[PDB]
Scaffold this active site. Sequence first.
Site, PDB file in Angstrom:
ATOM      1  N   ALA A 118      -0.492  -0.464   5.752  1.00 40.19           N
ATOM      2  CA  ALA A 118      -0.128  -1.462   6.760  1.00 40.19           C
ATOM      3  C   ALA A 118       1.208  -1.102   7.417  1.00 40.19           C
ATOM      4  CB  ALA A 118      -0.094  -2.780   6.017  1.00 40.19           C
TER       5      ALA A 118
ATOM      6  N   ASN B 195       5.035   1.033   2.798  1.00 40.30           N
ATOM      7  CA  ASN B 195       5.269  -0.067   3.741  1.00 40.30           C
ATOM      8  C   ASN B 195       6.720  -0.180   4.182  1.00 40.30           C
ATOM      9  OD1 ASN B 195       2.672  -1.233   4.047  1.00 40.30           O
ATOM     10  ND2 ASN B 195       2.813  -1.900   1.894  1.00 40.30           N
TER      11      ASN B 195
ATOM     12  N   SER C   5       0.839  -1.225   0.000  1.00 41.60           N
ATOM     13  CA  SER C   5       0.000   0.000   0.000  1.00 41.60           C
ATOM     14  C   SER C   5       0.851   1.243   0.000  1.00 41.60           C
ATOM     15  CB  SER C   5      -0.585  -0.032   1.437  1.00 41.60           C
ATOM     16  OG  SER C   5      -1.677  -0.897   1.351  1.00 41.60           O
TER      17      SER C   5
END
EC number: 3.5.1.11
Lengths: 557, 206
Positions: free
Chosen positions: A69, A241, A1
Amino acid sequence: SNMWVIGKSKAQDAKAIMVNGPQFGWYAPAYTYGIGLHGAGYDVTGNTPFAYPGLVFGHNGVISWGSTAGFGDDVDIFAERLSAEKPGYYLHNGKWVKMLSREETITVKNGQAETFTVWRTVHGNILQTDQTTQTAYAKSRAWDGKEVASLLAWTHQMKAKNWQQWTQQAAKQALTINWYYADVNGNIGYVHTGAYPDRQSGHDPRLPVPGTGKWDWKGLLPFEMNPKVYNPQSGYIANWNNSPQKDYPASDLFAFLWGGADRVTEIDRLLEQKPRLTADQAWDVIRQTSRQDLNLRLFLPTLQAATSGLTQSDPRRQLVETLTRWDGINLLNDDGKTWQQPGSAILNVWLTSMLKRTVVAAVPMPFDKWYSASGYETTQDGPTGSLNISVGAKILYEAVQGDKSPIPQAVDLFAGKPQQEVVLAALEDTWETLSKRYGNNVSNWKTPAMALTFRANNFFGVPQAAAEETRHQAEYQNRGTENDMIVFSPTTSDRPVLAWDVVAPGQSGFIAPDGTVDKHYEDQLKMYENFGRKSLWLTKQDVEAHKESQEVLHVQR
Amino acid sequence: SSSEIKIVRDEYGMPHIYANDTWHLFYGYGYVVAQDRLFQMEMARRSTQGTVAEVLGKDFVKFDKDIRRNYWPDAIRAQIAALSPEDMSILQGYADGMNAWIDKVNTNPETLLPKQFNTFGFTPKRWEPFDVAMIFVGTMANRFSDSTSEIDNLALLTALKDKYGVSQGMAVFNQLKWLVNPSAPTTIAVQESNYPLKFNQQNSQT
Ligand SMILES: [Ca+2]
């Protein structure tokens, strides 16, 4: 992401711009759900995974938010001491404590039901047991007991009107998630949220600890320890990330590393290239990063160095000259199935050979297989998620950096040979494999492109649509499952906020019993392909002006 | 009106909910979710709770057992029992709104039941707050915040120790799975701050 947030000092024609591309894989019907809420203190617009009560992506007219995340290490495994006699008990702080246990019955369509038992200790549910050592492993989560509060924090934060109110809700979100903030005044912020354990001295968080009492966590670290920044000196916040901050330790996953080779650098280079960016240019970063080979940047200098003293007609060198002429952007040919340049195919073959000669060779079987993938591994349907730099490739990057890498090379991965010799050997392997399948004229190599599938099964492998509902996209894009952009204080409109998103295939997944497909079943699918987007409305005027229908309910609780 | 919920859909079919209190607001939200995504929501409910084999059979029994092994339902129910009435309203409004559309669907299935249900041979059931909470636990906490490979790590470490001996085995383990690497690109610049804690990386717990 990934996520890029652009503040006042970097934005052109606006005070703030937020672009988010959460990467969950691609599904039919759509992984996220668009929804506007007006009332009871709420005034929001956006979209969110599985229609959660709280919107993970959106804004409320004053602030906007988004997530990626986090990958911090918030789970540790406790090796519990069992007893052959007195089973169902475990040693904890000098006494034999009884386990919690529950029986479960799995009903099976057209089969017999199955029943089993689930065990739990003070540390968590038992994952596995070792009756030979009389050891049972308990998985201990730092967020255990805070699942519902995390859901509610994600809801309540939609009412915040500034940083102070927003961080109070970020302090209650216990899952390892990165949270991002932007506002109408051009302020921008970031918090690596979640609950992290306060471990005892000498606890190495990558390996199990005895569950008998002395290694128990002391508690949870305070929120003041969570990495966070507000109005950064740089003018922007970017994440793919990668690591939140200097010295912050990553998940204990053997396949997960934060090293010198990281795909976030691909976003940084683009945001640092221009002094200021407009909304249209922030949006265009989606298209560049979607198409960018991630390994080129990393290993092109090594390839150049090793083939520098080779002659014009040595094929190993002509492979490197092809790469040197390429910017690493993959584009489709007119056929819709092959890439315009062979670069990714060459890097893939080279990298698989380089890993097999270096990292793989130093690790005992069967752990060697963990480090062999090149990171291009896919199938006909295409990658199930984002493209990344593989673990093996991140470890190999440290190795080719020499004494410029901070990681002590306890084993020489080149095993006594000069690097350049191992590089040239792998390049010979690459030429042999590719010329055999395509021939010797590199200029007419037509190598296969990756495609993209919107799957009918959801991420667990379970059907959530019939198999024919699968959709195919010819071009694979390393981008968010959805993309959403929020622009605060546009100089080009009278509105204080403008926002856009794209939720493909569409907002509805309804199909009537006679097979008639809803009007909004797939009206966003071509828009996704073309990097287009639709407007998100928030004010009443704008909602009324774009209304297609209305339904009024009268209910009392 | 306090009893009124107005639902406006835009040109892409995106629902906007107008209500005057919490329970009505999230009742509206659940009702449009049931309109748009019933089959997806029902399969996600079965996935997160491990009840897939009841409608799909023997291939899903291991899956169902693995899902039920990975959480403790009573702990979730206790968290729901401690909510205040305003927070509880979010969850139960949402489930009640879903239920209102599911009631109309199971009453007029000839025109309203999603095709999928006939294909797979089963019909939708009513929701409670616990189901709403389990969608988020199952797809958010469990997919993105439950990662560990500590047991595998140890099996790698043990194998490196046998190959290179005890001290060097450890140093090779730190070469492959380092705890931190100071050259990693970070979202926060060093000028702003760095993490204050330092950790053990010798597996000192043995
Ligand atoms: Ca850990």
